[PDB]
Structure formats: structure tokens, C-alpha cells
Amino acid sequence: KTLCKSWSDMKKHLNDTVSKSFIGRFFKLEARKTTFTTELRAATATFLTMAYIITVNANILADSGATCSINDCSTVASSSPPGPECVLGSNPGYEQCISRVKKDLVVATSLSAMVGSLAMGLLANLPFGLAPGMGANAYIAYNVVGFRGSGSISYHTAMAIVLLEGCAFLAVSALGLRGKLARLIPQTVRLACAVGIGMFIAFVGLQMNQGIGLVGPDKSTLVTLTACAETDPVTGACLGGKMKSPTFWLAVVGFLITSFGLMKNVKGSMIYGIVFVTAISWIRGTQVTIFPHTPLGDSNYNYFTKIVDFHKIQSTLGAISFTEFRKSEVWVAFATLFYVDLLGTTGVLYTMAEIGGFVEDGKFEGEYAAYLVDAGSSVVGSALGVTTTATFVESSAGLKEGGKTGLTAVIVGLYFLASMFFTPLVTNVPRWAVGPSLVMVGVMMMGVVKDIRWGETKEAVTAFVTILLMPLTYSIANGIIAGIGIYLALSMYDVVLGVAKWLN
């Protein structure tokens, strides 16, 4: 009929008047042959594969106990609450503190993914998006700061490391010291570190108080399968009954329809696995509720019955303190976070330049203004309370549908503006819904393990120690250090002595 004919000739005309206006001259839409309409399809598919890190990042930096401390705890029958009693849960005053910080990290992630993505398109003309990157969320929140105020480094110092690393990554890039520096790292340590982070981030998404709750303590094997139904109220311990938890099996169904959606190539599928096992866990009354009948849960439901809200940052705003940079374990956390960002935004940003055909004999057309926008956005992301940004590989779903200019990245920046207003629906995602989303990240990073040269022995001993010691010793710093230490001693003690025997 002429109904679709009246629909098709308008899209032949709306794509002309955009290119005949001024906005086609800035983004250069005449060359880089494309139209206005197929840029909008390139940014819709980029956002849906990227919309999961708006909730994963909030539910993983609220476990850090961001600004809640011992002073704003509750009052009990004693004269004063002691040290470790408040920060392990079951409190009227501390749990209402941490419900006002997760509302300040959903807004602070959209405002960090706006500025990173909206400044990528306007300054570099490149079709990809930015957000706080996955992989360095778990290093700061679980290994530097730790689960609810553990560890040694406070959260105010951890947001000062991100500034001083962010300013160290502009002025190692503006001088030209990148190809001199990144090629110094060998291929096997660079490639096996991305596998061990994927196994650390999935062992996070299995524990009792972190994600679903499979693994647990044991007094002779040091880890065992619990999955227990009736557990301890105060702490997490198995009282009895294995594999019959209604919060465990509802999370497995979310893990299947995420994986049954990735095959058959549904673009956004990790967002539909989160929405399905959340929309069951909102009905009051069941055993899988996030809304119980406690006074600690009536305040979340009375905020849920309104579906939109304009919420402002008020707790985890600019909070920096350089008054702790004169001890030892601050700089070790500095040299680790400088290491994992140098290898994250180097192998990704050039690989996403050869898809779509930007590249010539080196030096694609947005080289110099993409290393700095990816670096300055960690500085503006550190004042707002979140971690470093990274150019996402999910942005490839927009490279395979015809996005080639910077109008892709501006529209991606405008869905994050249209998703900070839905704050009452995003703070209320349960921690067993975000569990399988931390496991499918580990599936997609282990897919690079078929490029490690397992033929030679020195390349396989170095790659095995780095992969193994990251999820076991519960440390990312103990896999980077114990990989370089094996790679030198197997190599320096015969080759370097042999070169120094012949160079003189």
C-alpha cells in the first residue's frame, strides 16, 4: 500500500534537510557516506548493549560503603556503638545511610557517562560511547577500599588516586609517551591479565553477601558450596538445606535468558535479564521480595510508588583528601590502576578503529583527541564519586550498523540524560539480579584466551600464574606482580647475562 510509501519518502526527505543544514557540516556527513536516520539506529544499538553499566556500577560501589562511616550509625542499648558492629548490617541508622548513597551513585554514573560520551563526539568525530569502565570498579571497591569499610585505604583517598592517575594519563599522552611505554609490556602478561580479571569479577558474583550465594566458608577446604535456604539473620552462615534457596534459583533463570538472548543475536540482552528477575522481585509478599514489611523496607517502597524523580548529588560529591599519600600501600594501588588503564584503552581503541574502515597506515583520523577525552573524563568523574572511564567494546554494535561520525556518540549521551530521571526504578534492583550480569562479563573476557601462545613453556608458566592467583588470593595486585616476577626470572637469568657477556 501507500502507507509505507508515505513513510519511506519522508525519510528520504528528512535525511536531506539535516545534511542541507549546518549540523551536517560540523559532523561531516556528506563524506563518510551515511545519513541522519542510520546514525540514530547506530546509537540505539550502542545504548542497549551498554545500559547494564548504570546499575552494576551503583550496586558495586555501594557495597564499598562510600561515605557512610561509624559516626552516622544508629543508637542501641549501649552508650555508644562499637567499631565492627555497625558496618556489618542489621542497623536502623547505617542501612538508611547506605540507601541514600546508592541514590547518589545512580545519578553520578549517568552524569559521568554523559560528559565522557558527549565530549567524544563533539571533539573527535568518533562513533563510540563512554561510561565508568568495568574491571576497575571491583579493584577500588573490593580490593583497595573493600566491603563496607574494611581494608586500609579510606574512600576519600581512593577518589584522590583517580584524580592523580587521571592527570598522569593526560601528561603521558600529550607528550607522546604512549608507544614508547605500552610496547614495553610483553604480549603474554598483557593478554593474560585480562583473563584473570574476568575470573576475579565472576568469583565476586557468586559469594553470599556480594551476589547470589553459591560459595561459602569451610573450616577444612576453605571454600565450599553452600546455596543454603535458611541462613543466619545477622551474618551469613549455612544453618541447613542445600540448593533450595528461592533467591538462588531465580538468579539462574536470569542467567539462562541472558545467554539464550546473546545467541540468536539480540542486541541488548543483559538488560532484559536484569529487568525480568527484578519485575518478579517487586511483588510484596513472596520469599524473593526486595520489599519486606520491615521499617528498613517501607522507606524503599514509599520511594518506589513514584516512578520518576529529579535527584541531586548530596553525599558522594567532591570528596578528596591528599592527607594519606605518605604511606606505602597508597602508591601500590596507584601503580596498579595506572597499569590496567594503559592496557585497557590501547588494545581496545585501535581494534575499534579497524572495524568500520577509519584506518590507513597507522594514524586514523581521531588519534590525538581520543586519548585525552578518555583521560580527562576520569578527572571529571572522580569529583562526582565514581571510578575511571573506558571506551567500551559494546560500542561495536554501532560500528556494524553504519555509524561513522560523532552524531552517534552525542545521541548515546542523550539516553543517559533520559535515564537519570528514572532513579526510583534503578536503585531498587536486587543484588541477586545483578549477580549473573557479573558472570557474563567473565565469559566475554575469557574469550581472548585462545591467543596466548601455549606452545612455548615460558609463555605458558607466566600466563598460568597470572590467571590462577587473581581469583584465589582475592587480589588483582597479586597477579600483576606474580606474573612479572616469573617472567623476569625465567628470562633475565640466562638471556640478559648472555647479552651482557657479548655486549662488552
Ligand X SMILES: Nc1ncnc2[nH]cnc12
Residues forming the site for a second copy (CB under 8 A): 146-147, 150, 199, 202-203, 206-207, 214-218, 220-225, 256, 259-260, 262-263, 442-443, 446-447, 449-450, 452, 454, 456-458, 460-461, 464, 468-469, 471-475, 478, 489-490, 493-494
135 binding partner (options a second copy, ligand X, none; Cβ < 5 to 8 Å by kind): ligand X
> Binding residue for ligand X (CB under 6 A) from 344, 385, 403, 424?
344
Q: How far is the CB of 344 from ligand X (least distance, A)?
A: 5
Beta strands in 162-237 (DSSP E): 215-216, 224-225, 230-231
**Interacting partner of 305 out of a second copy, ligand X, none (Cβ under 5 to 8 A depending on kind):** none
Asked if 399 interacts with ligand X (CB under 6 A), we say no
3-state secondary structure of 389: strand
Residues forming beta bridges with residue 379, ordered by sequence position = none
Q: Which is nearer to a second copy, 331 or 493 (CB)?
A: 493
Q: How far is CA 484 from CA 188, 198, 199, 463, in A?
A: 10, 19, 19, 10
Contacts of 133 (CB under 8 A, 6+ apart): 344, 387, 388, 389, 390, 392
Q: How far is the CB of 133 from ligand X (least distance, A)?
A: 3
Single out the residue of 348, 353, 434, 465 in contact with ligand X (rule: CB under 6 A): 348
Q: Residue 297: helix, strand or coil by DSSP?
A: helix
Minimum CB separation from ligand X for residue 250, in Å?
25
Nearer to ligand X, 61 or 134 (CB): 134
Q: Does residue number 390 form part of the binding site for ligand X (CB under 6 A)?
A: yes
Q: 479 φ, ψ to 5°?
A: -110, -30
Q: In the complex, what is the shortest distance from the CB of residue 365 to ligand X, in angstroms, rounded to a whole number?
A: 21
CA within 13 Å, CB half, 259: 14
**Of 19-27, 29-37, 275-283, 389-397, which segment contacts ligand X by CB under 6 A?**
389-397
Helix (H, G, I), strand (E, B) or coil at 153: coil
Does residue 133 touch ligand X according to CB under 6 A? yes
Total number of residues binding ligand X (CB under 6 A)? Answer: 9
User: What CA–CA distance (Å, rounded) separates 344 from 227?
Assistant: 35
Residue 285 and residue 297: Cα distance in Å, rounded? 12
Q: Cα 97 to the chain's mean position, in Å?
A: 24
Q: Which residues bind ligand X (CB under 6 A)?
A: 133-135, 344, 348, 390-393
